[PDB]
Design a protein around this ligand. Structure first.
Ligand SMILES: CCCCCCCCCCCCCCCCCC(=O)O[C@@H](COC(=O)CCCCCCCCCCCCCCC)COP(=O)(O)OCCN
Ligand SMILES: [Zn+2]
Lengths: 1320, 650
C-alpha cells in the first residue's frame, strides 16, 4: 500500500531537482550507440510520458516546467557538446510528435492546459533556430521534422472547434509562431514564405481576431468559421484535419440518435467547422460526397427525443456557413432527391416526409441566395438551378388548401422574388422558356375575395398569399417578352395577342375589387403592385398589347389613369428601331455623366472614383474594375487613375508586390489590364516558336531533363543540357527583340508602378526596375510559357516530354530577372554560367518600357470611342448605391462647400436621368472574364449538347455548311444569315456547332463565304454575344483564314457595321475581305460547279426586267437599278459605297409578300411603303406605272397564293395612332385631380416632338408642375392650332373624341364640346 | 359686351349699377358647378378682352374673396376665375395683381407687428398669394418684365404660414423658372438653357423641400390644391408651425441669384439686378421687426457695392438691437435682428474700399459677439471671423506684422472702454494676446452642431500659420507666441500630436528651455485642464491626461494651480474607473502631487486673477439652457458707439 505511494513522493522530488539545475544529470553523456539509444534521449522520453498521464496531476504539472527549462538557450548546449545543432532537432521534434498525437487521439481533462505549455515550447525552439541560422546556415530538415511539422498542424485545427473558449483563443494565437518560423528558414518572401507555407497570408489574420474581447461561443464561432472559409490551397495539414475529425463526427452522430445538452453542443461545433473547411478536401464515392448525403438524411430527422433541435440547426448551418466551393455539389444532390418525388407519368406523391423535405429545401435556398459573400459569384455559375425550381412549385401546387399549406406557398412565393435579384449571377440554359412558365403557374394562386366566401377570419392569410404572389410576378415580368408553347400551330403573331389578353383581364379583374368603395393599407399596397405589374407587361411587348391597353385611358380610378400615361410617355421617347436614336438622344443625354465620373479632382484626387471604390460592396468588384478601366482609357486618362489607386495600396502596405498579387479591388485592376491587352501580345509572339519545338522533325524526340534521379542512361546528359540551353536562347532572344510590339496600355501600367516604388524608395541598392522586371515577367510572361494550352495558345496539350522543357525554361528565365545564381540547385548549376552574360541584356528590355514619359504629351491617340455599352452599366451601378456613396462624400470635403463638388453634382444629375432601364435577357450561358477556348470546349463537351434535339435542328437549317473546295483547293464554308433568329435559340449552341465543324480543318488555311442575302434586324448579333466570337475560337485558326467572300450585301448591314465599328476595327481595311460586287465575279474566283450557294437565293436568279437608271429620290439621290423579280423586287444601287474601306454596290431585296403598300403617286415617281419601315421609298422613273403595273401584278399573284389574306391587322404601334393619344391627353388635361393634370402635360410634350407637330407656344417636359384647375382655355387653343396645321388627323381624332364623350361625366362633357367644334 | 360705356359714366351713380351686375354673375359661377367649363369660355373669357373694363372687374374679385377668408369657397373660386380673365391681357392683369402685392407689404410699416401672421393685413396678402400661384403657369405672369418684383416677394413668404401656403410658394418658384425656359420674347442661347434646366431639377430635390419647410410631404402639388374646393372651405389644423432659420434664406437667395445672372448675360443692358437691389435696400434701413431681418440677409447676398455711409447704418442697427434686448422682456423678437446684422456684414466686407480702417475694425465686432453666449449668435460670429482673416491675407496686411500688432494697434484709441470689458469677462488682451484670442475659441467645442466644430478648428489652423510665418519657424515650432494654438489643436490634429510628442512615451511640447516664464506656463496648464473638465470621450481624455501627468514632474512649482479644476472629476475616476489605458495616467498624477507636497506653496489657486485670467475656465463652459443676455452687454453698447465715432466721423 504505502510502498507504491513512496515511489511517487521520490519521483516527484527527482523531477524538481532537474527543474533546479539540469546540468547535474546531463554530465558524462553516454552518446548514442550504434545499436542502443544514448543517455540524453532516454532522460527526455521519461519526462514526456508523464504530461498526459492525468493519474498523477501534481507530477504532470511539474514535468511541464522541467521540460521547459531544458529548452532555454543556456541548457541546449548540454544535450550533446559534440554536436549541439544536430541532436537537438532530432530529440525535440520527436517530443512534439509524441505529444501532438495524444491530443488528437481523444479528449483529456487537462487538454486546455497542455496547450498553454505547448505554445511556450514553440517560442523557445524558434529562438534557437534564429541564432543557429545566424552563426552558420549550412538547420537540417530530416523526415521527422516534416513528419512532426504536419502532426503539429493537425492538432491546431481540431482544437478550433473545441467547446472551451480558452482553448480556441490560445490555439489561434499559436499560429504566429508557425508563421514566424517560416521567415527564419527562408528570408526571401516569394520563394519560400508562399511556397513552404502556402496559406501564409490567411494565418496572419488568425492573430488579429484572437486579440479581441471575449464573447459567448456563438459569437466567436462566427469569426472562426469565416477564417476557415478562406483556406484556398490544399495542404497535408488541412487534408488530414478534415478527415480525422470526420470520423469522430460520424460515430458521435450514432450515439445521439441510437440512444432511445453538452453532448449536442459539441456535435454542433464539429459540423460547423467541418463545413467551412470542406473546400480543401474537394476532389463518385469520396469522403466529401458521403458527408453531404448523411447531412441531407438529417434534414428530415424524425426523432422524438431531440429531433427538433437537429433540424433547426442543420438548416441554420448549411445555409449561412457552407463554403462557396461546395455549391456545385449541393445543388446536384439536392436536385436528384427532389426528382424522385415525381413518378413516371409525372404524378406527385404526398408522403408527409417529402412535405417536410421541401419545406426545408425552401429555407436552405433562401438563406444561401440571400447572402452576398466573397467569391460566391464565381461558383454560382457552374450549376443550373432551373430544373429544381420548376419541380419544386409542382409539388406545392397540388399540396392542397389549409392553414398549413398556405404558409408553405407564402414562403415559396418569397423565394422566387429573391431568385430574380441574382439572375445575372445564376446561369440559365433557357431563360424565356423558364420565366414564362413560372408566371403561368403563379397567377393561378392569386384569388381575390376568397376569404369572405370561406367565412373564416383564420384564413386572412390568403390576403398575404395574394399580396406575396404579385410581388413575385412583378419581378418576373420586368423585361420578359411573351412566348406561347407550340402545342398547336396558330401563327405566332395571333398566339401572343391571345396570350396577352389572358393576363391583362386577370389584372383588371383584380384591380376592380381593390377599389376602396367596393384593410386600407392592404388594398393600397395590393392595388399599387397590381398596377406596376401591368406596366412591366406592356413595356416588354408593345406591338402585341398596345391595342388591348388603350381602354385604361378612361378608367374609373383617377390614380390608375395617371400611371398609365407615365409609362406611355416613355415608349414614345424610345426608338421603335435602332434609328441611331440612342446614338443621338442617349449619347447627348448621357454625355455629361462621364464628365462627372471623370471629374479631375484637384491634384489628382478623383473623388468620384476613389469614393466609389470603397463604398461599392466587394461582390461587384469584378464589374467595377472593368467599367473604370474601359471608361478612363476612352478619355486618354488611364495613367491618372492608376497613380491614385496604386499609391494608396502601396503606401498603405510597404509590401507593394505581395498585395497586388493578392485579392483586392486594386489587384483585380491589374488582372483586367494584362488579360484584356496582353492576350494578343503573348499569342502573337510565342506562337511561331511553339510550332518549331512541338512539330518540327529537326527537334525530333529529345528529353529536356537534367535530373540525375530521373536522368535516362540512353540520352547523354551533355546533349540534353546543350539542347535545353539552346532552346532557352531561342525564347529569350524573341522576348527581348519584341520590345516595340508591347501594347501601350501595359507600358503606362509599368510606369505608374515604377514611380510608386521609386517614390516608395525615397521615403524608406534596391533597383526599382529589378522589382518591376521580376514582377511583370513572373505574372504576365511566365504563366503562358508553362501551360500554353490552358492559355489557349495551342489547341492540343503538349506532350509531357515537351512540357518539362517549358517548365525548366521558366525557372532559368526567372532567375535572370532576380540576378540570383543557383543555390542548393546543383541540378541546374552548370547553367549558371549562361545567365551571367544576359544580366545586362535583361535590364535594357525593362528600361525601355519603364522609360515611357510620365505624361504622354508626345504619345497620343485621340480615338475617343463612344463606348455605348459600358456607359449603361456605369449609370446602373450609381443608382443602386446612390445613398451610401453620399455618406462617404459627406464625411469629408468640409473645407469647401460641396455645391460645386461631387455630392451636389451627383444628386442633381442622377435624379435628372431617372431610374435605369431593366437589363435584357441573356441568350448565352453564364460567362465571365475567365473564359478561353479551352474552357469553352470543356464546358460544352461536358454538357450533353449532342442529344439536345435543338442542336440537331441546326443541321437541318443548313447554317455554316462545308461546300467542296476552292481554286487554291482550300475547303469552303457557307454561313446563311437568314437562318438565325435573334433569340429563339440559345446563342452558345450555334457557336459550338460552328466550332465543331471547323475543328477538323481549321488548322490548315481555309476560305469562308458568308451569304447576307435578305439580311434583316430580326437576324442579328447583339454587342455582348458578338464579342465571344473573337475569344471562343483557339486563336491560331484566325490566321488560317485564307479569304473571305461577301455576297448580296445590303444597306442595313452597312448600318450595323457603323454602330459596331469599334469591335470590327481589326477587320477595317482587311486584305482577306473580298466583296462580290456582281454575281459574275464570284464564280470566277471560286471553283464553278463546286460553289453551293443557297438554292432559294439562286431561285431569284436576278433574271427579270431591268429598269436601268432609276433614281432614288431622298435626302440624297443615288442611282438605283430595279429588277422586278417573279416573287420579289431587288433594288441594286449603281454607285459604289465604302464599307470597311472597300467599295461595293448595295443590293437591297424586298420580298413580294412583304409589300403591304403600293401607291403610284405619279407617273414621274411612285411610293413604296413596306412593313415597319417608317417613311416610304420614293424613286423617279419616266414610266412608273410600267414598273408599278408589274409590282401590282406580282403582289396580286401572291394574294392568290396565300391561303387567307383577309384575316390581318388587329395590330398597331404608337406611330400608327397619333390621333388616339392626342384625345386622351386633352381630355385628361382638364380633370379634377391635380396629379393627373401634371401627367397629361408631360404626355403632350412627348407627343408634339416625336411627330413634329406645329403649335404656337413651346412645351417643356418636367415633373412637379402645379397646373391651375381652370384649364378650359389652354386646351382650346392647342386644339384649334393643331387642326389648322394638321388637318389629316381629323378622322383619327374625331372618332375617338366621340367615344370618350359617353364615358366622361357631366362636367367633363361640356369640355369635349368646346374643343371638338374647331375640327369640323 | 356693352358695359364699356357705363363703367365711366361720369360717376352719375350708374357706375354703382354695373358692379351689381358683375357681383350677380360671380354668384352664378359659385353655384352652377356643372356648367363651369362653359361659363369660363363664354362669360369671363370674352369679358376679359375689354381693356377699359379690366380695372373695375379685377377690383370686385378681391372684395368678394376678402369676406370669405383665406380658405373660404368664395375666395378659392375667384382665383380660378382670374385665370380666364388674364388670358386676354397678360400684360395688364399680371402688372396689376403684382402692383397690389407690393403695396400691401409696403404698408406693414405703419403698425409693426412681431410676425406677419399677427399683422392685421395678413389675410389680404394670403388671398393675393393664391392669385399669383394660378397665374404663374404658362407665363400668365409676364416674367420678361416682372422677374425682379417676383423674387422680391418670394423671399418674404418662404416657409411662412399654414402648410398649404408653404407648399404654394414652392410651386410658385417652380413655375417661374419653367416660364423662363419657354418664353419667346427672350432669346436665350443654347448654353444658358442648360443652366435653367438643371436648376429646375434642383428645386425638386429633398434638399430644398427642407429649406422651404415642407419636409415630410411627398409631393407639393397635392397639398397645394384641394379637390373638393367648391363644396367645402379649407379646414386648417395642427397649428404647430416649424421655425425658420436665416441661414436657410441664404441658400435660397443665392440659388435664385445664380439663375438671374445667367439670363442677364444674354439680355443686353438688363436692369433686373438694379431693380431688385433697390427694393431690398428700402426695407433694410427701416424699422419693421417682421421684414427687416429678412431684408438684410438679402441685401448683402446680392449687392455689388458698399460705401462707408451704408456700413455706419448697419453697425448702428446692431447697437440698438442689443439695447432693446436688456430693456424689455421680449428677447427672441430682437435676438434675430442681431444674427442678421452679422450675416450681412459677413457678405459685404470683401467689397470694401480695400484701404478703409474698418477692414481691421471688424475684428473686434466679431469678438464682441462671441461674448454673448448664444448658439445662434456664436455660429454667426465665427463666420465673420473666419472670413475676416481670409480677406486680410489677399490684401497682404500680414506680410511684415503679427496679428497681435495689427489688431492691437487699431484698439489703442478707444482702450478706455475696452479695458472695463476685459475686467468682467475674465480675460485680458494686453497681458497675453495669443491666449485671450483662444479662450473665445474654446467654447466652440461645446456647440451642438458638428458643422461649427470643424469651422473653429480651421480658424485655429490659419491663426497658427500666421504667427509662425512672422518668425519663419516652419509653422510647427514651439515658442511663446505659438504655444496656445498647439494645446487647442492637440486633441484634434494628428500632425500636431505627432510633430509634438510627449517626451516620456521631433520636438516635444512642454520644453522647459523655452517655456521658462511662470506666467506663460501657468496658462498652458489651465488650457489642458479646461479641455478635460467638460470633454466626455475616451480618446480625448486619454491623450489629455498623458500630457498632464508629464506636466506634474516638469513643472512641479506651478502645477498646484490646477487642482480645483481636476479635483471633482479625478476623485470620481479613481473610485469607479476600470480602464487600464486611462487609469495609468491618473495614478501618475496622484503620486507626483504627494512627492512635490513638502514645502509652502509658491503659487496659490488665485494666482491667475493677479494678471486678469481669472475667468478663463468659466468662459469655456457649456452653453446655458436659460438663454439670456449675460447682462454685461451694457458696455458693448458704449464700445460700439465709440468705434463709429473714431473711424466714421461723418
Ligand atoms: C473574329 C470575327 C468577328 C466577326 C464575326 C461576325 C459574325 C459572323 C462570322 C462568320 C460565321 C462563321 C464563323 C467565323 C469564324 C472565323 C471568323 C474569322 O475569320 O475571324 C477573323 C477574320 O474575321 C473575318 O474575316 C470576319 C468577316 C465577317 C464579315 C464582315 C463583317 C460584316 C458582315 C457580318 C456582320 C455579322 C453578321 C450579320 C449581323 C450584323 C478575325 O481576325 P482577327 O485578327 O481579328 O482575330 C482575332 C485576334 N484577336
Ligand atoms: Zn446548358
Amino acid at each position: 500500500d504505502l510502498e507504491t505511494r513512496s515511489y511517487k513522493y521520490l519521483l516527484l522530488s527527482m523531477v524538481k531537482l532537474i527543474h533546479a539545475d539540469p546540468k547535474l544529470l546531463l554530465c558524462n553523456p553516454r552518446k548514442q550507440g550504434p545499436e542502443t539509444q544514448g543517455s540524453t534521449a532516454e532522460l527526455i522520453t521519461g519526462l514526456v510520458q508523464l504530461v498526459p498521464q492525468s493519474h498523477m496531476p501534481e507530477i504532470a504539472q511539474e514535468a511541464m516546467e522541467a521540460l521547459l527549462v531544458l529548452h532555454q538557450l543556456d541548457s541546449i548546449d548540454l544535450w550533446n557538446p559534440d554536436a549541439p545543432v544536430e541532436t537537438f532537432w532530432e530529440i525535440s521534434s520527436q517530443m512534439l510528435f509524441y505529444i501532438c498525437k495524444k491530443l488528437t487521439s481523444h479528449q483529456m481533462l487537462s487538454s486546455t492546459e497542455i496547450l498553454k505549455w505547448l505554445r511556450e515550447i514553440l517560442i523557445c525552439r524558434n529562438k534557437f533556430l534564429l541564432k543557429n541560422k545566424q552563426a552558420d546556415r549550412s538547420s537540417g530538415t530530416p523526415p521527422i521534422c516534416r513528419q512532426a511539422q504536419t502532426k503539429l498542424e493537425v492538432a491546431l485545427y481540431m482544437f478550433l472547434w473545441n467547446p472551451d473558449t480558452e482553448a480556441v483563443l490560445v490555439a489561434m494565437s499559436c499560429f504566429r509562431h508557425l508563421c514566424e518560423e517560416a521567415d527564419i528558414r527562408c528570408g526571401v518572401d516569394e520563394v519560400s514564405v508562399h511556397n513552404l507555407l502556402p496559406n501564409y497570408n490567411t494565418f496572419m489574420e488568425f492573430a488579429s481576431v484572437s486579440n479581441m474581447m471575449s464573447t459567448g461561443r456563438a459569437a466567436l464561432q462566427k469569426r472562426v468559421m469565416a477564417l476557415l472559409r478562406r483556406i484556398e490551397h490544399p495542404t497535408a495539414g488541412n487534408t488530414e484535419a478534415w478527415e480525422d475529425t470526420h470520423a469522430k463526427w460520424e460515430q458521435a452522430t450514432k450515439l445521439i440518435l441510437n440512444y432511445p445538452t453538452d453532448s449536442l453542443q459539441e456535435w454542433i461545433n464539429m459540423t460547423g467547422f467541418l463545413c467551412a473547411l470542406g473546400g480543401v478536401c474537394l476532389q463518385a464515392d469520396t469522403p466529401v460526397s458521403k458527408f453531404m448525403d448523411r447531412l441531407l438524411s438529417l434534414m428530415v430527422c424524425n426523432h422524438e427525443k431531440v429531433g427538433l433541435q437537429i433540424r433547426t440547426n442543420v438548416k441554420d448551418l448549411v445555409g449561412l456557413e457552407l463554403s462557396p466551393a461546395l455549391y456545385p455539389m449541393l445543388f446536384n444532390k439536392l436536385k436528384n432527391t427532389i426528382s424522385k418525388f415525381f413518378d413516371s407519368q409525372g404524378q406527385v406523391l404526398l408522403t408527409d416526409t417529402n412535405t417536410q423535405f421541401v419545406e426545408q429545401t425552401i429555407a436552405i435556398m433562401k438563406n444561401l441566395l440571400d447572402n452576398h459573400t466573397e467569391g460566391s459569384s464565381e461558383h454560382l455559375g457552374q450549376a443550373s438551378i432551373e430544373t429544381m425550381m420548376l419541380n419544386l412549385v409542382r409539388y406545392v401546387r397540388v399540396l392542397g388548401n389549409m392553414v398549413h399549406a398556405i404558409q408553405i406557398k407564402t414562403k415559396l412565393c418569397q423565394l422566387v422574388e429573391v431568385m430574380m435579384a441574382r439572375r445575372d449571377d445564376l446561369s440559365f440554359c433557357q431563360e424565356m422558356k423558364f420565366r414564362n412558365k413560372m408566371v403561368e403557374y403563379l397567377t393561378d394562386w392569386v384569388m381575390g375575395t376568397s376569404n369572405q366566401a370561406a367565412d373564416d377570419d383564420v384564413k386572412c392569410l390568403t390576403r398575404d398569399l395574394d399580396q406575396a404572389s404579385m410581388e413575385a410576378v412583378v419581378s418576373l415580368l420586368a423585361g420578359l417578352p411573351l412566348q406561347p408553347e407550340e402545342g398547336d400551330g396558330v401563327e405566332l403573331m395571333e398566339a401572343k395577342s391571345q396570350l396577352f389578353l389572358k393576363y391583362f383581364t386577370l389584372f383588371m379583374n383584380l384591380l376592380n375589387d381593390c377599389s376602396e368603395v367596393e384593410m386600407s393599407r392592404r388594398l393600397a399596397s395590393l392595388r399599387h403592385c397590381t398596377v406596376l405589374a401591368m406596366s412591366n407587361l406592356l413595356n416588354a411587348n408593345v406591338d402585341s398589347g398596345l391595342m388591348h391597353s388603350i381602354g385604361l385611358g378612361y378608367h374609373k380610378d383617377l390614380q390608375t389613369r395617371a400611371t398609365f400615361m407615365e409609362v406611355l410617355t416613355k415608349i414614345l421617347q424610345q426608338g421603335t428601331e435602332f434609328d441611331t436614336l440612342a446614338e443621338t438622344v442617349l449619347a447627348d443625354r448621357f454625355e455629361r455623366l462621364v464628365e462627372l465620373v471623370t471629374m479631375m479632382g484637384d491634384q489628382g484626387e478623383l473623388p468620384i472614383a476613389m469614393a466609389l471604390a470603397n463604398v461599392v460592396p466587394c461582390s461587384q468588384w469584378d464589374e467595377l474594375a472593368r467599367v473604370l478601366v474601359t471608361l478612363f482609357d476612352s478619355r486618354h486618362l488611364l495613367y491618372q487613375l492608376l497613380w491614385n489607386m496604386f499609391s494608396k495600396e502601396v503606401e498603405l502596405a510597404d509590401s507593394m508586390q505581395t498585395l497586388f498579387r493578392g485579392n483586392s479591388l486594386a489587384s483585380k485592376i491589374m488582372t483586367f489590364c494584362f488579360k484584356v491587352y496582353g492576350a494578343t501580345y503573348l499569342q502573337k509572339l510565342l506562337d511561331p516558336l511553339l510550332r518549331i519545338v512541338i512539330t518540327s522533325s529537326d527537334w525530333q524526340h529529345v528529353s529536356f531533363e537534367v535530373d540525375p534521379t530521373r536522368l535516362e542512361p540512353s540520352e547523354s546528359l551533355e546533349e540534353n543540357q546543350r539542347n535545353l540551353l539552346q532552346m532557352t536562347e531561342k525564347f529569350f532572344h524573341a522576348i527581348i527583340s519584341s520590345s516595340s510590339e508591347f501594347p501601350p496600355q501595359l507600358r503606362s501600367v509599368c510606369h505608374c508602378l515604377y514611380q510608386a516604388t521609386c517614390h516608395s524608395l525615397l521615403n524608406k541598392p534596391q533597383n526599382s526596375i529589378g522589382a518591376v522586371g521580376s514582377a511583370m515577367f513572373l505574372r504576365f510572361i511566365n504563366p503562358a510559357i508553362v501551360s500554353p494550352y490552358e492559355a489557349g495558345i495551342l489547341d492540343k496539350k503538349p506532350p509531357p516530354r515537351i512540357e518539362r522543357g517549358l517548365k525548366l525554361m521558366s525557372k532559368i528565365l526567372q532567375s535572370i530577372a532576380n540576378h540570383v545564381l543557383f543555390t542548393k540547385e546543383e541540378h541546374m548549376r552548370p547553367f549558371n554560367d549562361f545567365v551571367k552574360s544576359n544580366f545586362d541584356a535583361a535590364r535594357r528590355f525593362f528600361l525601355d518600357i519603364a522609360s515611357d514619359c510620365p505624361t504622354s504629351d508626345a504619345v497620343n491617340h485621340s480615338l475617343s470611342f463612344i463606348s455605348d455599352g459600358n456607359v449603361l452599366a456605369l449609370h446602373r451601378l450609381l443608382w443602386n448605391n446612390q445613398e451610401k456613396i453620399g455618406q462617404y462624400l459627406s464625411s469629408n470635403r468640409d473645407h469647401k462647400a460641396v455645391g460645386r463638388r461631387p455630392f451636389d453634382k451627383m444628386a442633381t444629375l442622377l435624379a435628372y436621368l431617372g431610374p435605369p432601364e431593366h437589363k435584357p435577357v441573356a441568350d448565352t450561358h453564364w460567362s465571365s472574364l475567365n473564359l478561353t477556348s479551352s474552357k469553352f470546349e470543356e464546358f460544352m463537351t461536358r454538357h450533353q449538347v449532342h442529344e439536345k434535339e435543338e442542336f440537331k435542328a441546326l443541321k437541318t437549317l443548313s447554317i455554316f455548311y462545308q461546300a467542296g473546295t476552292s481554286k487554291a483547293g482550300n475547303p469552303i464554308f457557307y454561313y446563311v444569315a437568314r437562318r438565325f433568329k435573334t433569340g429563339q435559340i440559345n446563342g452558345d449552341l450555334l457557336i459550338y456547332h460552328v466550332l465543331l465543324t471547323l475543328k477538323p480543318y481549321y488548322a490548315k488555311p481555309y476560305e469562308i463565304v458568308v451569304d447576307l442575302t435578305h439580311t434583316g434586324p430580326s437576324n442579328r448579333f447583339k454587342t455582348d454575344f458578338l464579342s465571344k466570337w473573337f475569344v471562343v475560337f483557339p486563336g491560331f485558326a484566325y490566321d488560317n483564314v485564307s479569304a473571305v467572300y461577301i455576297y448580296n450585301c445590303n444597306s442595313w448591314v452597312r448600318e450595323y457595321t457603323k454602330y459596331h465599328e469599334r469591335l470590327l476595327t481589326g477587320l477595317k481595311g482587311s486584305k482577306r475581305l473580298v466583296f462580290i460586287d456582281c454575281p459574275g465575279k464570284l464564280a470566277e474566283h471560286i471553283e464553278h460547279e463546286q460553289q453551293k450557294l443557297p438554292a432559294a437565293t439562286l431561285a431569284l436568279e436576278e433574271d427579270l426586267k431591268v429598269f436601268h437608271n432609276a433614281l432614288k429620290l431622298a435626302h440624297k439621290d443615288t442611282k438605283v437599278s430595279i429588277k422586278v423579280g417573279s416573287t420579289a423586287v431587288q433594288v441594286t444601287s449603281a454607285e459604289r459605297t465604302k464599307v470597311l474601306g472597300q467599295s461595293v454596290f448595295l443590293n437591297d431585296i424586298y420580298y413580294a409578300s412583304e409589300i403591304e403598300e403600293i401607291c403610284l403617286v405619279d407617273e414621274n415617281q411612285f411610293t413604296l411603303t413596306i412593313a415597319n419601315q417608317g417613311t416610304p421609298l420614293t424613286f423617279m422613273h419616266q414610266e412608273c406605272e410600267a414598273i408599278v403595273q408589274s409590282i401590282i401584278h406580282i403582289r396580286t399573284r401572291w394574294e392568290l397564293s396565300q391561303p387567307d389574306s383577309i384575316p390581318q391587322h388587329t395590330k398597331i404601334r404608337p406611330k400608327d395612332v397619333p390621333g388616339t393619344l392626342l384625345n386622351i391627353a386633352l381630355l385628361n388635361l382638364g380633370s379634377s385631380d391635380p396629379s393627373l393634370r401634371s401627367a397629361a402635360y408631360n404626355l403632350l410634350c412627348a407627343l408634339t416632338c416625336t411627330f413634329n407637330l406645329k403649335i404656337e407656344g413651346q412645351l417643356l417636359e418636367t415633373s412637379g408642375l402645379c397646373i391651375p384647375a381652370n384649364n378650359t382655355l389652354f386646351i382650346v387653343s392647342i386644339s384649334k392650332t393643331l387642326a389648322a396645321n394638321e388637318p389629316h388627323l381629323t378622322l383619327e381624332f374625331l372618332e375617338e373624341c366621340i367615344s370618350g364623350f359617353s364615358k366622361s361625366s357631366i362636367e367633363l362633357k361640356h369640355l369635349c364640346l368646346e374643343y371638338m367644334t374647331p375640327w369640323l
